[PDB]
Amino acid sequence: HYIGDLVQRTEVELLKTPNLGKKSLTEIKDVLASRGLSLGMRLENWPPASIADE
Amino acid sequence: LSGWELNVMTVDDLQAKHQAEAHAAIDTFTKYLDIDEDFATVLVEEGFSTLEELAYVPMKELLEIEGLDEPTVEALRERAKNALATIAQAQEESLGDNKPADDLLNLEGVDRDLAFKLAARGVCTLEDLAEQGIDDLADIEGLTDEKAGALIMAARNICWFGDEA
């Protein structure tokens, strides 16, 4: 539901599932061109330190 | 409760379905047996299970109706010949309607019928099957979402790792 969950998983792991399509790969590339998501990161589960509970 | 399949319709819907089945069976029997239509209507009026493989049933009760039907058994053999042509049309259904290439046919985890069902949606090669999605392959009831996902993943792996043997 959140793009943080998309950034938590690798692009190779998403490419190993056929739920994404060929045009969806191009859309994912267009989204990752801004380098805000799908940059190959690893989170704790959800929250960064700036994302703190208060 | 009865254990057998049921169909629910209206009475006028029953008459409409009987008229549609009558017209379809009359057109099929006229195309397959080469007879007149005015006699075909009067024959299919009394005919139970109007015209489909009824030669195994006793056709001597049709001699109680008016007219002679001596040569029609030979027409049944002609129907068999037409069935052979129909079988050739089934071969056309294998071949003429977007037959799958050697890459799609030799893909592991898919049979000839599954390859034909996948290639019936415009695809021809394994790369074309990889271009299709799970939702696009879900239109065919023969393939399930997990099976279409596995086939798409296998085709994408064959396309991506084709450099390695």
Curated annotation (Swiss-Prot), chain A:
Modification after translation, per record: Acetylated on Lys-22 and Lys-23 in the presence of glucose. PatZ controls acetylation of Lys-23 but not of Lys-22.
Region spans: Alpha C-terminal domain (alpha-CTD): 1-54
Residues with N6-acetyllysine modification: K22, K23
Superkingdom of this protein's organism: Bacteria
Record comment regarding domains: The N-terminal domain is essential for RNAP assembly and basal transcription, whereas the C-terminal domain is involved in interaction with transcriptional regulators (such as CRP) and with upstream promoter elements.
Role played: DNA-dependent RNA polymerase (RNAP) catalyzes the transcription of DNA into RNA using the four ribonucleoside triphosphates as substrates. This subunit plays an important role in subunit assembly since its dimerization is the first step in the sequential assembly of subunits to form the holoenzyme. Part of the processive rRNA transcription and antitermination complex (rrnTAC). The complex forms an RNA-chaperone ring around the RNA exit tunnel of RNAP. It supports rapid transcription and antitermination of rRNA operons, cotranscriptional rRNA folding, and annealing of distal rRNA regions to allow correct ribosome biogenesis.
Family under the similarity heading: Belongs to the RNA polymerase alpha chain family.
Quaternary structure and partners: Homodimer. The RNAP catalytic core consists of 2 alpha, 1 beta, 1 beta' and 1 omega subunit. When a sigma factor is associated with the core the holoenzyme is formed, which can initiate transcription. Both the N- and C-terminus interact with different regions of transcriptional regulator CRP. The rRNA transcription and antitermination complex (rrnTAC) consists of RNAP, NusA, NusB, NusE (rpsJ), NusG, SubB, ribosomal protein S4, DNA and precursor rRNA; S4 is more flexible than other subunits.
Protein name: DNA-directed RNA polymerase subunit alpha
Gene this chain is encoded by: rpoA
Residues of the full protein shown: 276 to 329 of 329
From Swiss-Prot, chain B:
Induction comment from the UniProt entry of this chain: In response to low temperature. Negatively autoregulated. Induced by cold shock (42 to 15 degrees Celsius) (at protein level).
Subcellular location: Cytoplasm
Gene knockout outcome: Mutants are sensitive to DNA-damaging agents.
Stretches for region 2 X 51 AA approximate repeats: 34-159
Known role: Part of the processive rRNA transcription and antitermination complex (rrnTAC). The complex forms an RNA-chaperone ring around the RNA exit tunnel of RNA polymerase (RNAP). It supports rapid transcription and antitermination of rRNA operons, cotranscriptional rRNA folding, and annealing of distal rRNA regions to allow correct ribosome biogenesis. Participates in both transcription termination and antitermination. Involved in a variety of cellular termination and antitermination processes, such as Rho-dependent transcriptional termination and intrinsic termination.
Family the UniProt entry places it in: Belongs to the NusA family.
Intervals holding Sequence repeats: 34-84, 109-159
Subunit structure: Monomer. Binds directly to the core enzyme of the DNA-dependent RNA polymerase (RNAP). Interacts with nascent RNA. Interacts with the termination Rho factor. Interacts with the phage lambda N protein. Interacts with SuhB via the AR2 domain, crystallizes as a 2:1 SuhB:NusA heterotrimer. The rRNA transcription and antitermination complex (rrnTAC) consists of RNAP, NusA, NusB, NusE (rpsJ), NusG, SubB, ribosomal protein S4, DNA and precursor rRNA; S4 is more flexible than other subunits. NusG and the alpha-CTD of RNAP interact with the AR2 domain.
Residues in the signal sequence: none
Shown residues in whole-protein numbering: 331 to 495 of 495
Domain notes: The N-terminal region interacts with RNAP. The central region is composed of 3 RNA binding domains, S1, KH 1 and KH 2. The C-terminal region contains 2 acidic repeats, AR1 and AR2, which bind to protein N from phage lambda during antitermination. AR2 interacts with SuhB and RNAP alpha subunit C-terminal domain (rpoA); AR2 cannot bind to both simultaneously. SuhB, NusG and the alpha-CTD of RNAP all interact with the AR2 domain and can displace the AR2 domain from the SSK domain (S1, KH1 and KH2) of NusA.
Protein name: Transcription termination/antitermination protein NusA
Acidic repeat 1 (AR1) as annotated region, ranges: 15-96
Phylogenetic lineage: Bacteria, Pseudomonadati, Pseudomonadota, Gammaproteobacteria, Enterobacterales
Region (Acidic repeat 2 (AR2), required for interaction with SuhB, interacts with RNAP subunit alpha (rpoA), NusG): 97-165
